[PDB]
Amino acid sequence: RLVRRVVIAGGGTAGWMAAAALSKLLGRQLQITLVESDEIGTVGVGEATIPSLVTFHRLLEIDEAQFMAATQATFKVGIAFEHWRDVDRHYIHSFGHTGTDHWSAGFQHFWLKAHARGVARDFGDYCLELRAAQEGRFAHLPNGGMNYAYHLDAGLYARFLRRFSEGFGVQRIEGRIGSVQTDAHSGDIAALVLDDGTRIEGDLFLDCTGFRALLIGQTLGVGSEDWSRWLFADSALAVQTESVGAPVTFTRARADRAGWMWRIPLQHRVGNGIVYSSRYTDQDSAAQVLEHNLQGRALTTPRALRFTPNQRHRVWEKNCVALGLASGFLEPIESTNIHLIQRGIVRLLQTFPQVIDPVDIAEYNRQAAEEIAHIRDFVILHYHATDRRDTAFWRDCASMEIPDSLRHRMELFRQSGRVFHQGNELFAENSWIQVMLGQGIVPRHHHPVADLMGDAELSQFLEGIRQRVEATLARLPPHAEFLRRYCPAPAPP
Amino acid sequence: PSESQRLVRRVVIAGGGTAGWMAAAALSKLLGRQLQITLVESDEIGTVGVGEATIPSLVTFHRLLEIDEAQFMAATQATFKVGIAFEHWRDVDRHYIHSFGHTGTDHWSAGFQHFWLKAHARGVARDFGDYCLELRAAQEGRFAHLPNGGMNYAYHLDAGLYARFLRRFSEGFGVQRIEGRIGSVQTDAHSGDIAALVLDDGTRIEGDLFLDCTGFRALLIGQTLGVGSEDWSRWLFADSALAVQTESVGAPVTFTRARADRAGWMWRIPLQHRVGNGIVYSSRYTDQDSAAQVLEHNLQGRALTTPRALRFTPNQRHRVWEKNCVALGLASGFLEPIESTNIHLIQRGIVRLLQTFPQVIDPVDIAEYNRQAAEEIAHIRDFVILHYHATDRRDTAFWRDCASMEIPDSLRHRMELFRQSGRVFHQGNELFAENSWIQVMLGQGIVPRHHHPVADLMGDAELSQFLEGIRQRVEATLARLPPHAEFLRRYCPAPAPPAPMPQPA
């Protein structure tokens, strides 16, 4: 049966990112219908992103400045990780690349040798994007020389994508789903039945219904793998504050006693939140910690969220593809939520069915499983690589068993300073290095190629890199000045 | 134990030839100022006049080593290679080319083959090969470099001359060559590590890290350390070859020929002043005398050598790095030369070693090395199996068995993906690109039942205009390339041997 009708269950970022991409590419031959309820809204929730979204908008021919102005967006070049290695020990995990590699050995080997010889500055001084986070500067550079992403209002983003999608013929139906129907012989989803009795028939259904996974889970019975043995957070509180100064170019991830706090700058507001574990603390205490750390007064009543670190066992089952929370969830410590939605959509478009076949489904599921396990391991790394023993939460994080896949990467770096990137893993070599060095893993050896340079040659190699970083950084304007010239957003009412 | 005693300062390479001298060359180039590197080889071991085909990774190897391409080619009687002509694989008298490069133009949502498949269903497609420049250069016998690596290519070379060229390079970076035969291998009583080699004259060569380049003898990784190998003969039946050089009968073509027969296949490889030939076959399906007759029947020109008989078996060493020993080349495994992977697998073992080169040897480094090696070779294994399993042939028991055998699940999934939806993917550092999977599966008769629906957006005129614009760009580029022989004469002319010995007909 030819796939001619796609029904998207749920709106928000997952549903409207899917509608936007599907209608842009295939909307001239597909009937695309999205069902969502006006009773759900996310406007005024700030969210951080990663550079894959730049590519997504290139594929969709979305104008960056128009998108940013419509979503109150600012630029992002990294995440400032405060108090993770230990209290008062901070580092930045930035985009980009540090230093110059040799074909046999990455830059970190030269930096490690130089540091042992006392001729190295901080590892981050050799990375432009990291310095741009420290100094609050941003502009685009020729030939994609600046690696960046965005801080955005997720509700305004969904609204922008809705306008885009409706322009490519997406049919929006306002309502709630009262029943999901299956086919008696195949087990496929046949239709959704709305709360007014309307049956919406389709060939392929996207489950964007959130954490309940109404289609792939409650209807088709696909369970999820629970990761709470490794990842203890299960709660969040979020609140916006007034801006108190020019927008920084980084997201802040500030560890506390039993969780951590995000701070995300938008053009005229700041998004804040605390992520914590209900098995170690309670909502009242977390609200107190969040309030204590806010700059400026809160503008909204805090919004509470409950979640589980998890992954749907298969993200494509029969004629249903899950996206967003219905496919899984990891806390926003590395800003991966919108990325995982995008990956599910782009992979679906690259495997789009003429007819649906098990071999396509199996390949899709294999890729999704591999990609998410890699991101999970990197999230676990943030909690497990810590010197902190000051609360039960941190002692438990440091002492837990971890996936063998993560243990092997940590051991490789600890022994020989080596990191290796595979396939379509999200996190690049630079990310593994910045985070492991930043959180206190010290390689016992470095690559022998770095020992070929004497002290003066090695010091000059590093210093040349650092001078080029500083010379480039000096040409970049303050963030707020660039925003004003490139993508000024209207002041909220 | 002593920690300082763990530092790797002395590297001993057991065996010469391609494996040993490629290893010596790369290791001495990069680390010869810090390591004492010794290579042990016997003058009684080795064969003169082996012609071998390669793949584009060797171009990168020479860039890493700063080996000049024209000097290397002139020194090894080398010619250029843009692909392999596969004759009689899909069926008797049905041929195709597996080239380097990429066919057509992709969309971000769908590879070129989906547009070609739609065009074929609409009757507006030419042969798939017409949309690939390297393939057309194979058909027309043309070659030159193009700006920004616009031509993808590798080499046909004399392997013995290549090893001698690398020996000269290596000695220049300080490698110490010791001629002789290894009489025994000494191990450490407590660790089992290799401690030294002892030659037949009593010479003791100590080292910290040992590279086993001894071939099927596997003196270190096999005979000493006892690492077994995985048997792949349930999927791959060839175990024998006969090889012979012939005089050139014309200008050198730009492709390696892989011509299937009843129970094996034959290679034909052009060098600047001779041609390499061989038949690869299964002793379980035919005998040497019959294989010799088939080879003789297909030869062009007089033979320049007496045919040499070879034995082998498809396999991978269970671990290629064991304790302080790294196996390379035949000691690490073997696949038949159907996709010209022998020298590539040596290079990968060397490059991977240099990228994880030990200050001290540690199990986590060994484990990572072995994992990468195992994943890479299994992927190449599957592609070799694909050549035998994807066939219409039922005309001999050999082909019926190849078509009906069980295959690895990893290969079955790739074949089913293409058969159902025309889809291919490339993962990690797998050798074979999407273009390779597509050309070989289409060429050997896997017919996609569906294609990506994005191609259904194009009407016939738009689709034909898309394909014809690609074909016109291929043909305009091809018309600017000279005949292979003219390019060789100007770029890398090798001296003609003075006294070849053609045998009377």
Author numbering:
A (entry chain B): 11 to 503
B (entry chain A): 6 to 510
Provide the authors' original text about this structure.
Flavin-dependent halogenases regioselectively introduce halide substituents into electron-rich substrates under mild reaction conditions. FDHs depend on reduced flavin adenine dinucleotide (FADH2) as a cofactor, which is bound by a dedicated subdomain. As a first reaction step, FAD-C4a-OOH is formed, which subsequently oxidizes the halide ion, resulting in the formation of hypohalous acid (HOX). While BrvH preferentially brominated screening substrates, the X. campestris (Xcc) halogenases exclusively brominated them.
Xcc4156 and BrvH have short loops in both positions, resulting in a more open substrate-binding site compared with Trp halogenases and a solvent-accessible catalytic lysine residue. Like BrvH, Xcc4156 does not halogenate free tryptophan; these enzymes do, however, show activity towards free indole and indole derivatives. This can be explained by the lack of stabilization of tryptophan in the substrate-binding site. The FAD-binding loop (amino acids 47–56) of Xcc4156 does not have continuous electron density in chain B. Indeed, the loop is partly disordered in one chain of the apo structure and is fixed in an open conformation in the other chain. The FAD-binding loop, which changes its conformation between the apo and the FAD-bound form in related enzymes, is involved in a crystal contact in the apo Xcc4156 crystals. In apo Xcc4156, this site (Thr346 and Asn347) does not contain any bound halide. The asparagine in Xcc4156 is particularly interesting as its side chain occupies the position that would be taken up by the ribityl moiety of FAD in a FAD-bound halogenase, thus possibly hampering FAD binding. Thus, apo Xcc4156 crystals provide functional insight into FAD and bromide binding, even though neither the cofactor nor the halide is visible in the structure.
